[PDB]
Symmetry: none
Amino acid sequence: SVEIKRVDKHHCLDLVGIFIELERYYFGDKAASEQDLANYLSHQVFSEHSGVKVIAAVEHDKVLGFATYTIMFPAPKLSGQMYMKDLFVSSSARGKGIGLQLMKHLATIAITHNCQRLDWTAESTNPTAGKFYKSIGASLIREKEYYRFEGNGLNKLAKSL
Amino acid sequence: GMSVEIKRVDKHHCLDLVGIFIELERYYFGDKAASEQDLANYLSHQVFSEHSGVKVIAAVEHDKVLGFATYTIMFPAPKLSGQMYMKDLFVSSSARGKGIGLQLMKHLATIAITHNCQRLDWTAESTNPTAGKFYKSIGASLIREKEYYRFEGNGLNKLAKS
Amino acid sequence: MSVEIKRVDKHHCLDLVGIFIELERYYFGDKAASEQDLANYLSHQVFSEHSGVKVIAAVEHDKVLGFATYTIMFPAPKLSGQMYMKDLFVSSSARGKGIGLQLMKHLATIAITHNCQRLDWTAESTNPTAGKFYKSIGASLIREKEYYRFEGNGLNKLAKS
Amino acid sequence: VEIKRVDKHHCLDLVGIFIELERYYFGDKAASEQDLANYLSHQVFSEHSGVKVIAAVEHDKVLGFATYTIMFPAPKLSGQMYMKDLFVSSSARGKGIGLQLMKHLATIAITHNCQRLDWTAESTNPTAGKFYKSIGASLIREKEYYRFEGNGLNKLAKSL
Ligand SMILES: [Cl-]
Ligand SMILES: [Cl-]
Ligand SMILES: [Cl-]
Ligand SMILES: [Cl-]
C-alpha cells in the first residue's frame, strides 16, 4: 500500500511537493518558491558535501512524508550512530502512521549498517512530538546538552580564524 | 610555516588517527576501550566508508595527531541552508592548554559559512560540566528547548522488526 | 511551467545526445558530428575523471530543451571561487520560454551558495545578439580582459619544444 | 626544477606561494596563513572545484604554480583547457618558470584530447600580454568577457 524507498539524486525533484509543504508549515509566508527548492534539492541536499540521505513514503505516486538521516562517527562499541535530522508527514497523509513506518525503515537501515543507536531531537515547544516519540519506545536522554553558533555569532568565530 | 597544522584526513591516511582514537576509547570506555587492530578496521571500513556521513579535520604537530573533529552537514534547515553538526571534538591530554579545541572549531565555523551553513551545532554531556563552560566561554549558546531522543540495542532491533 | 531544470549526471549523460546533435549543426552545419561520435564524446570526455564541468538542463516531456555547462575555478579574490559558464544552449524548438535566463538564474544561485562572488563567461562579437541578451539581463562587459590561445600545431609545438 | 601536480594530501605545500600571491595582488588585504590553509583544504581542493594545480619545485620550495580546468563542449569533439592562474615567485624571476609551467600544461592538454589551451590577461598588465605573444600565443579579439558579481550576482540569484 505505502512504500518507503530511498530517493536518489536522479529523482530528487520528486521531493519538491513535500518540501514546499514543509516550508509552508515551518515558515508560513516566508516559504521558499518551487524553483528555489528544486535548486536547493539538486545542488545542496543532494550535493557531494551533504551528509544526509533521504527516504520517502509513497502512495499512488505522491509523497506522503520523508525523513533525512546521516550516520556519524565515532561512537561506542566500534559502530555508527545514526542521526535523523528531519521527520515530516504531509497533513494529507495524517492518521495513517506514516511517521512510524518511516522510523521503522530508518531502524532497518541502522542495523544493516552496524549502527547501535538512532538519535534525533525534538522541540519542547512541540510537546506532541515528544509524546509520540515516547509512545513508540524512544528514550529521552536528559544528560544531553545542545549547543549552537549561528548568524553573527557563527561569523565572528569564523572571522577569528 | 606554523608548528601546529590543521588538515583534512582522508581515507588514504585514515590510519593516522589510530593513536588519537586509542586515547579517545580509553577516555570514554576505560576498561572497554577497543584494541589497535579493531580501531584500524573501524577507521578503514566504517569511519571512512560509503555510508559514513562525516569528514575529519585534525591538529598535527611533529607528525603526531594532537586532536581531531568529525563533522557533517545536514539538510534540510531554515533559509534554504545547511546545518553543520560536529559529532566529536577530542583533544589529547598531552596537548592541553595549546588552544587546539578552539582552533579546530574556528576551522569548522569557516567551512560552515563558506558551504551555505548558518548554524554549527553539537552536544555535550551534563556529566562533563567542563565542556559546557568551555563552549559557553567561546560564545556558544545553549539551546534549552531541544530534547534528545534515542533508540539503541534491543529497542532498535524491536523497532526494526515489529 | 512543465519545464524542469535538473542536473545531468554521468549515468544519464546520453540524455544529452539530442541537444548536442542540435548544437553541432548550429555551429558546424555539415561538419556536425554523428550521433555515435556524440554518445562517445559524452560518455568518455564530457563526463570523465578529467572533465572540470557539470551540467544542468531544461527538460520537458523527457526532451532536453536546453543546457548549460559550468565549472568553479580557483583561486580568486576574497578567498572565494569564480564560477565560469562554458556554454549556454537553447534549442530552436524551445525559444521564447525564457529558458536561457532560467538556466542562468540557477547557476547564479549555485555560485552564491558555493562561496562564489563571480559568474563569468564569454561571447563572440560575431554573434551580436548574444551580447545584447547578456547586457539586457544586467551583465557587465569586462573590456580589460584579453583572451589568449594556443591551438593545434602551436599547441603541439609548445608541449614538444 | 620539477613540475608536478599537487594532490589533496599535499595541498598545504601551496600555503607559502599562496601567501606571496595574496601580498602581490591585495597588499595589506592579504589573507592570513590559517585562512589560506583552510581555503586550500576545503575549496581549492573540494569536490566542487573544477581546477587542478601544478607546481614547480626546486629544493623542496615552491617557485610557482598554475591552476587549470578542462571544459566541454568544444569543437572537433574535444576539450578546451583553460588556465585560471599562472604565478611565479619573485624569488624565482629570470628562470623561465612561467614558460615551463605552460609547456607542462600543454603536455597535459594534448594527452587529454584538448585542441585548445585558453586563458586571459589584463590589458592594464601589458607585460603579461607581451610575454604571452612572445611564446607564440594568439590574441582572440572577437572574444567578449562577461561577468555578474557582488550585488548584481545576488540580484540575479534572488530572481530565481
Ligand atoms: Cl519537533
Ligand atoms: Cl583518500
Ligand atoms: Cl556567443
Ligand atoms: Cl594578467
